[PDB]
Every structure is written in C-alpha cells, then in structure tokens.
Amino acid sequence: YDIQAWKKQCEELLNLIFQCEDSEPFRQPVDLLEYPDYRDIIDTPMDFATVRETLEAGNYESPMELCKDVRLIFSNSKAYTPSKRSRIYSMSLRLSAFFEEHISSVLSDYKSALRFHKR
Ligand SMILES: COc1cccc2c1CCCC(=O)N2
C-alpha cells in the first residue's frame, strides 16, 4: 500500500527500456532533419528521454500519467509508419509488449494503494 512506490518502479522499468535494443529509435526526440515532415503528422512528440526527465523532475503525479506518455511514443510510431512491416514500427510493437507486461503491476499496485489510502 505504498502510494509512492511507483516512481522507483518506473525508473527501473525505464532503465530496462534504455538497455533494450528495440528502444534505440525512441530514446531521444525525433530529428526533424532526418524526418522533415514528422511535425505535419505528429501533433505531440514524445520520446523516452522526455519521459525520464519528466519523472525525474517530479512532474508526474501518478504512473497513469507516465503510461499515457509512453503509449503516445507507440501511437506516434504507428501514425508515422509508412508500413505495418517497417523496421522502426516493428521495434515499437515489441517494446510496447515489453512495457505493457511490466507496467501492469505498477498500475495495479498504485491504484490499490490509493484505494486503501481513501478507505
Ligand atoms: C521518438 O521516436 C519516434 C516517435 C514516433 C515515430 C517514430 C519515431 C522514431 C523515428 C521516426 C520514425 O520513423 N518513427
């Protein structure tokens, strides 16, 4: 029932994500010089360095907010891909499966702790 435990859990999950080779395209904001039209398609850019910095700044109140930003990295990849068989998109799908598998207990434990707090 520790309401703050999610933060270190998210830090450790982001560390695992940065070790994953599949996170390479998503570790830093997309380079507009490499993808000139990216901002015509993507309204809200997101990347794992921005997620980590937001977390470390104390600018996430809950793991749901972090999860929303991580899911935005994956939905941006899907929206920008020219093909469902593209390399970067294919990496995003494996990374998303790994993220979802690991964030599930973080979210469940936080929501349970908060329900206990408000009992
Ligand atoms: C954070 O990096 C993202 C985010 C959304 C979409 C993509 C990428 C990587 C490079 C550009 C790309 O092909 N797709």
Domain ranges of the chain: 1-119
Handedness of CA 37, 39, 43, 49 (dihedral sign): positive
CA-wise closest residue to 5 among 113, 117, 103 = 113
What's the 17 CA to ligand 1 centre distance in angstroms?
Answer: 16
Three-state SS string over the chain comes to CCCCCHHHHHHHHHHHHHHCHHHHHHCCCCCCCCCCCHHHHCCCCCCHHHHHHHHHCCCCCCHHHHHHHHHHHHHHHHHHCCCCCCHHHHHHHHHHHHHHHHHHHHHHHHHHHHHHHCC
3-state SS assignment for residue 41: helix
Residue whose Cα lies nearest atom 14 of ligand 1: it is 77
Q: Does residue 70 contact residue 27 with C-beta atoms inside 8 Å?
A: no
What's the 75 CA to ligand 1 centre distance in angstroms?
Answer: 10
Experimental method: X-ray
Phi-psi region of 58 (alpha: psi -120 to 50; beta: other; left: phi over 0): left
Q: Is 50 in the pocket of ligand 1 (CB under 6 A)?
A: no
CATH 1.20.920.10 fits 1-119, yes or no: yes
CA-wise closest residue to 93 among 112, 79, 78 = 78
What's the 30 CA to ligand 1 centre distance in angstroms?
Answer: 6
3-state SS assignment for residue 59: coil
